[PDB]
Amino acid sequence: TFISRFAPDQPRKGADILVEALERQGVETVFAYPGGASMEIHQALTRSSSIRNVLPRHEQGGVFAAEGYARSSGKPGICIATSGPGATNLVSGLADALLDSVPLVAITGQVPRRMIGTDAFQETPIVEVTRSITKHNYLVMDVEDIPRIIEEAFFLATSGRPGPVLVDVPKDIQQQLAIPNWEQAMRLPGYMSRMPKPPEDSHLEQIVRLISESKKPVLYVGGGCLNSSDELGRFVELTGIPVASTLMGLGSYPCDDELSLHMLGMHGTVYANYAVEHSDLLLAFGVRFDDRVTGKLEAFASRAKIVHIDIDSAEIGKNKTPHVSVCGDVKLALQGMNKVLENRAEELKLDFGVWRNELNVQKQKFPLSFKTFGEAIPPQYAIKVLDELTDGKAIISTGVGQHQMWAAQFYNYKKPRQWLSSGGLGAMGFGLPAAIGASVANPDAIVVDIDGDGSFIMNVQELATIRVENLPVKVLLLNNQHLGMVMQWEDRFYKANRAHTFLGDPAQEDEIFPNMLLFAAACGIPAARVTKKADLREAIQTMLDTPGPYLLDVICPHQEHVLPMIPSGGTFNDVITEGDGR
């Protein structure tokens, strides 16, 4: 049973009830930054012997760290901020967690209840601000509600389609004395009654039947499969269907595998987008048919029967209309379909080697390619060397931009939750704090933040967090001195007319600005810069072998372009396969 630090008849502060509510959820780590409206919560945290606090240097760092914790572990991430300016600094993280379906519980202090609505000191209506960028939120109006609301928040954040839940706690409720009741029933009758049931054998056998009748099936795998790598891998054994993955699904099926078509979509491989373009059966498991993937919807999988299995009924038929649909956990659907495939194996005689051979011809004519100019370091090459020296077992977090795409293309993720990247919102500054959360959740792992120079500086203050918490976070900084992805679009569509994409100092144009090594130096983090491709392998090896945190500044020619590229709203026939800024 659970052991409380208080007697069952002993009144204690609401802040102490809230912390014990976290303890009763199995919480061991929080990311909490103190302020006036949350001082009581922070005092109660020091009284907890089972919950560790990682103090960020910015609440956006706190929420992004909670995301990295969640994405790398499957557990909910918990961040805590004070009222007013603390709460508003969470907003980008809440939106990011909602768009990527990341389970997250955010607790904000609030001004006393009687002060609400009066423009009080450090008051913002955070429940109103965040209603459209959270899965649910609460304003606690009585200390007796703390056990129930915390329980509901964790249940909502982690069940169904996961997402962020914000709990706003007025300071007077934190100080009120009460005796908690941990037996209160949750008040989610509508939500709980609309929870998907395990899929029926009726629907599952229709799918297995559709597979046997098809000649060109393609698996279309996304973020919803992160807990189904075993079931999915078994499914691929029994069917031999090639696997195309989204940015969010990377690693659900191993990238180094022969049946892997790698990533599809705007910057997906030519052969992955080819497969979807010419398929007759599209198995869309745990995906939401977003515009980065589909392009022009009418042309996406235009001659395929579309099977869509999603745990969110609101996603089924939202953009692309499926032929067959299953609303439920893809993990269960895979388990059920795997049994059918095992028994009726010899009756089905599944063989797609002719389709696979057609795709492997595309895989040989159009592989992912990069150019090497003299001794300049290709960013693609740097990530490939990191893959080798870490044996593809590192947890990878990124910023947003060209380096993000290259980290997606040129690292072979073997398991899900190695890949931590902001996909739906695409928020710069995510990589460094996310690596902080992933390292705390996986203390023995290799954690590398593959960051861009614009993204890295946005939350550079979290270097102090990495040092103080003694986290072995590695930073592989692909430094092209530009806002690279926006620069690439300037080259393609605006005649290379630069509009504020250069991040260096124009007074000293040929100097690396700023000097990221001194940012690491300021926080006592060893660092180095590498410029010549000949030095890169030993440089990365040094970063990995040096215990504790390390920053490697990898200088790269800025004229590189992420390829291939299907322009926004385009079709497969519009794919760009050559060119850069030279």
Ligand X SMILES: Cc1cc2nc3c(=O)[nH]c(=O)nc-3n(C[C@H](O)[C@H](O)[C@H](O)COP(=O)(O)OP(=O)(O)OC[C@H]3O[C@@H](n4cnc5c(N)ncnc54)[C@H](O)[C@@H]3O)c2cc1C
Ligand Y SMILES: COc1cc(C)nc(NC(=O)NS(=O)(=O)c2ccccc2OCCF)n1
Ligand Z SMILES: Cc1ncc(C[n+]2c([C@@](C)(O)OO)sc(CCOP(=O)(O)OP(=O)(O)O)c2C)c(N)n1
Does 165 contact ligand X by CB under 6 A?
Answer: no
- Which of 39, 75, 115, 122 is catalytic? The answer is 122
Residues 37-66 that bind ligand Y (CB under 6 A): 37
Q: How far is CA 346 from the centre of its chain?
A: 40
Between CA 151 and CA 442 the distance in angstroms is 25
> Strand 177-178 and strand 12-13: pairing?
antiparallel
Is 59 in the active site? yes
Is residue 471 within the footprint of ligand Z (CB under 6 A)?
A: no
Q: Please pick, from the candidates 50, 85, 121, 142, the single residue that binds a second copy as defined by CB under 8 A.
A: 142
Tell me which of a second copy, Mg ion, ligand X, none is bound by residue 561, counting a contact when its beta carbon lies within the kind-specific cut-off of 5 to 8 angstroms.
Answer: none
By beta-carbon proximity to ligand X, the closer residue of 61 and 223 is 223
Catalytic residue among 121, 371, 393, 538: 121
Q: Residue 482's binding partner, choosing from ligand X, a second copy, ligand Y, none, with beta-carbon cut-off 5 to 8 A by kind?
A: none
Contact assessment for residue 560 and residue 402, using Cβ atoms and an 8 Å cutoff: yes
As a 3-state breakdown, the chain gives helix, strand, coil percent values, each rounded to 5, of: 40, 15, 40
Number of residues that bind ligand Y (CB under 6 A): 10
Distance separating alpha carbons of residues 154 and 143, to the nearest angstrom:
18
Yes or no: say if 477 and 454 are a contact pair by the CB < 8 Å rule.
no
Q: Exposed, middle or buried, 580 (CB in 10 Å: 0-12/13-18/19+)?
A: middle
Token representation of residue 83: 């009222």
Q: Candidates 119-127, 288-296, 410-418, 448-456: pick the segment binding ligand X (CB under 6 A).
A: 288-296
For every residue of 508-567, DSSP letters joined together read: GTTS-SS-HHHHHHHTT--EEEE-BHHHHHHHHHHHHHSSS-EEEEEE--TT---S-B--
Feature table: binding site for (R)-imazaquin? 135, 161
Residue 330 lies near ligand X (rule: CB under 6 A): yes
Shortest CB 328 distance to ligand X, Å: 7
Indicate the burial class of 546 (C-beta count within 10 angstroms; 0-12, 13-18, 19 or more).
Answer: middle
From the list ligand Z, a second copy, Mg ion, none, partner contacted by residue 455 (C-beta under 5 to 8 A by kind): ligand Z
Residue 249's closest CA among 497, 421, 38, 67? Answer: 421
Interface with a second copy, residue 190, by CB under 8 A? yes
Breaks (C-N over 2.5 A) in the chain follow: none
Count the Cβ atoms, other than its own, within 10 Å of residue 145: 17
Q: Which stretch binds ligand X (CB under 6 A): 140-148, 169-177, 265-273, 453-461?
A: 265-273
Q: Which is nearer to a second copy, 145 or 469 (CB)?
A: 145
Kindly write out the interface string for residues 117-146 of this chain, putting x where it contacts ligand X by CB under 6 A and - elsewhere: ------------------------------
Question: Counting contacts by CB under 6 A, is residue 561 touching ligand Z?
Answer: no
CA 221/CA 247 separation, integer angstroms: 9
Question: Within positions 55 to 114, which residues make up the interface with a second copy, using CB under 8 A?
Answer: 112-114
The site map against ligand Z for 421-460 (x = CB under 6 A) is: -----xxx-----------------------xxxx-----
Q: Please, what is the minimum distance in Å from the beta carbon of residue 454 to Mg ion?
A: 5
Q: Which of 367, 352, 354 is nearest to 261 (CA)?
A: 367
Contact with ligand Z (CB under 6 A) among 399, 423, 433, 504: 399
Q: Which of 328, 325, 330, 272 is nearest to 300 (CA)?
A: 272
Tell me which residues touch a second copy (CB under 8 A). Answer: 112-118, 141-142, 172, 187, 189-190, 192-193
Tell me which residues touch ligand Z (CB under 6 A). Answer: 399-403, 426-428, 452-455, 478, 480, 482-486
Q: Which residues are catalytic?
A: 59, 121-122, 171, 485
Tell me which residues touch ligand Y (CB under 6 A). Answer: 36-37, 83, 111-112, 115, 120-122, 171
